[PDB]
Amino acid sequence: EDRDKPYACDICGKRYKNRPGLSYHYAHSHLA
Ligand SMILES: [Zn+2]
């Protein structure tokens, strides 16, 4: 599945199949 969903958020570990999916999570998650 690290083949199918090779990208991951460094804070929560959520896995993503595509970079734009992670990009959106990264932009808006885990903020004050
Ligand atoms: Zn995260």
From Swiss-Prot:
Provide the assembly information.
Interacts with the nucleosomes, in particular nucleosomes bearing histone H3 crotonylated at 'Lys-14' (H3K14cr) for which DPF2 has high affinity. Also interacts (via PHD-type zinc finger domains) with histone H3 butyrylated at 'Lys-14' (H3K14bu), histone H3 propionylated at 'Lys-14' (H3K14pr), and histone H3 acetylated at 'Lys-14' (H3K14ac). Interacts with histone H3 acetylated at 'Lys-9' (H3K9ac), histone H3 di-methylated at 'Lys-9' (H3K9me2), and histone H3 tri-methylated at 'Lys-9' (H3K9me3). Interacts with histone H4 acetylated at 'Lys-12' (H4K12ac).
**Subcellular compartments:** Nucleus; Cytoplasm
ZnF C2H2-type: positions: 7-30
- Organism this protein belongs to: Homo sapiens
Q: Which family does it belong to?
A: Belongs to the requiem/DPF family.
Protein's job:
Plays an active role in transcriptional regulation by binding modified histones H3 and H4. Is a negative regulator of myeloid differentiation of hematopoietic progenitor cells. Might also have a role in the development and maturation of lymphoid cells. Involved in the regulation of non-canonical NF-kappa-B pathway.
Kindly provide the name given to this protein in its UniProt entry. Zinc finger protein ubi-d4
Give from-to of the shown chain within the full protein.
203 to 234 of 391
- Which tissues is this chain's protein expressed in? Ubiquitous.
Disease cited in the entry: Coffin-Siris syndrome 7: A form of Coffin-Siris syndrome, a congenital multiple malformation syndrome with broad phenotypic and genetic variability. Cardinal features are intellectual disability, coarse facial features, hypertrichosis, and hypoplastic or absent fifth digit nails or phalanges. Additional features include malformations of the cardiac, gastrointestinal, genitourinary, and/or central nervous systems. Sucking/feeding difficulties, poor growth, ophthalmologic abnormalities, hearing impairment, and spinal anomalies are common findings.
